């Protein structure tokens, strides 16, 4: 049994780090024997909290989707005009859309009758049938163009990150925004205990080295 040794090194680094204290109400200064590629690192507090929050948000969504417990609010009188090919595209992926709480029926120039929407998307679309059309088309084209693979529910712990790519962009964007808004900000007061909990939780994240929007969460200063 052979494994790529470089994947294990990155994870073990942050696990061997002690918190110094908050710096300028914007960072958390941390400190790392056996120094191959690991001393002083400045962690962006907002990016740190946002990262913990996002992975918690992704884990929730995917556990809900996998187990078939993803809430789908009933939508009344919602019909959108679609092309012949667009009506065919939706007819094909109707089963795949149902996995995300997007329940609809294809009628017939043609039309799209949305019966259900997940509360997450019901809130975002906010009665805009054009936004809802653009967003469903976006995912349908992603599936078609192999830019996003379908959800494999043929499997009976849960690793959300092994189903992370399957998440439609619209949901990805929504969760990024929720994480960002709920996250601690620059200028906010953090106690050493608060900093310890944040860095402890961040080290338990699948990807601790970047925020929700793909920018770095920490910078080494030594």
């Amino acid at each position: 049994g052979k494994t790529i040794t470089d994947f294990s090194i990155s994870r073990s680094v942050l696990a061997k780090y002690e918190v110094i204290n908050q710096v300028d109400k914007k960072f958390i200064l941390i400190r790392c024997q056996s120094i191959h590629n690991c001393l002083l690192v400045l962690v962006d507090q907002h990016a740190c909290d946002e990262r913990i929050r996002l992975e918690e948000l992704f884990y929730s969504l995917l556990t809900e989707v996998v187990t078939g417990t993803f809430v789908a609010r009933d939508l009344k009188d919602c019909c959108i005009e679609v092309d012949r090919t667009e009506a065919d595209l939706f007819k094909h992926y109707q089963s795949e859309f149902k996995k995300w709480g997007i329940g609809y029926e294809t009628i017939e120039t043609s039309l799209l009758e949305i019966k259900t929407l997940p509360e997450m998307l019901t809130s975002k679309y906010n009665g805009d049938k054009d936004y809802l059309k653009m967003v469903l088309l976006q995912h349908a084209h992603d599936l078609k163009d192999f830019k996003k693979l379908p959800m494999d529910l043929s499997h009976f712990k849960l690793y959300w990150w092994k189903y992370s790519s399957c998440v439609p962009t619209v949901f990805h964007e929504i969760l990024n925004s929720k994480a960002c808004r709920s996250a601690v900000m620059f200028g906010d007061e953090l106690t050493r205990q608060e900093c310890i909990i944040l860095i402890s939780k961040l080290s338990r994240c699948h990807n601790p080295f970047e925020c929700a929007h793909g920018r770095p969460s920490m910078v080494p200063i030594a």
Binding site: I20, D44, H46, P216
Partner: protein
């Protein structure tokens, strides 16, 4: 109340300090913002001045500070009075080098003769219970209190007595007084906590716990007693400039996380 120090030597030691002080470095310490401990072994701490992060050797800064307090507050010190008594003869047992009684007795002899001087000018009270010629019965009553709410570690006390007799030159006024202040500051500086491997299974739980408590005690001392005092009265000498390093310029880091 405050005694008039008219000693030419003490004024000469004071003049050397006053000339040595660096203006721009003292400005950094005077307006510092303490972050925390970086290394308990190498005695490193982090501070923020303006919007720059600095790495400071607190051992060096504390040495310069306790030598400075001793110089300015000369012959006007307080006392740290000590069932659980400390013997000078039994204290030097930690040295295998002293393979004779006459060697251990020679250290105490120089110190007890100068006890009147050490008790008056430094508040280092030395009290003997037995005969004047006897040395085994000589103990230490009280040590000078340079900083309120700060009792130094007695781990360095046998080393302080060893260097008090074998290092300190008792044949020249200035060199004797300069040497004693250097010996007090060396004792007064917070102890080094050598890194103990926690992840190792070979070491006992009690060894691991006391190392954690040592670390806790140093951080608490620096945050509440040592660094507030440093920011108020410490005058940084030019020679300490190598022990004040800029590790980060924070405006540069703001650009990295400017847009989330």
């Amino acid at each position: 109340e405050r005694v008039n120090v008219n000693l030419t030597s003490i004024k000469k030691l004071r003049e050397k300090v006053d000339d040595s002080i660096h203006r721009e470095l003292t400005d950094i310490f005077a307006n510092l913002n303490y972050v925390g401990v970086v290394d308990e072994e190498r005695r490193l701490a982090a501070i923020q001045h303006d919007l720059k992060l600095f790495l400071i050797d607190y051992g060096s800064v504390c040495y310069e500070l306790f030598y400075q307090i001793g110089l300015t507050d000369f012959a006007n010190f307080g006392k740290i009075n000590l069932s659980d008594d400390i013997v000078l003869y039994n204290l030097l047992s930690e040295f295998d080098e002293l393979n004779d009684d006459a060697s251990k007795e020679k250290i105490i002899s120089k110190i007890w003769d100068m006890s009147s001087m050490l008790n008056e000018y430094y508040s280092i009270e030395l009290v003997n219970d037995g005969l004047d010629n006897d040395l085994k019965s000589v103990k230490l009553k009280s040590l000078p209190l340079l900083l309120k709410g700060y009792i130094p570690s007695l781990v360095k006390l046998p080393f302080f007595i060893y260097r008090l007799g074998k290092e300190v030159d008792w044949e020249d006024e200035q060199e004797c007084l300069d040497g004693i202040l250097r010996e007090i500051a060396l004792l007064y500086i917070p102890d080094m906590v050598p890194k103990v491997d926690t992840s190792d299974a070979s070491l006992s739980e009690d060894e691991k716990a006391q190392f954690i408590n040592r670390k806790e005690h140093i951080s608490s001392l620096l945050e509440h007693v040592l660094f507030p005092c440093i920011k108020r009265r410490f005058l940084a000498p030019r020679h300490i400039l190598k022990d004040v390093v800029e590790i980060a310029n924070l405006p540069d880091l703001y650009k990295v996380f400017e847009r989330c």
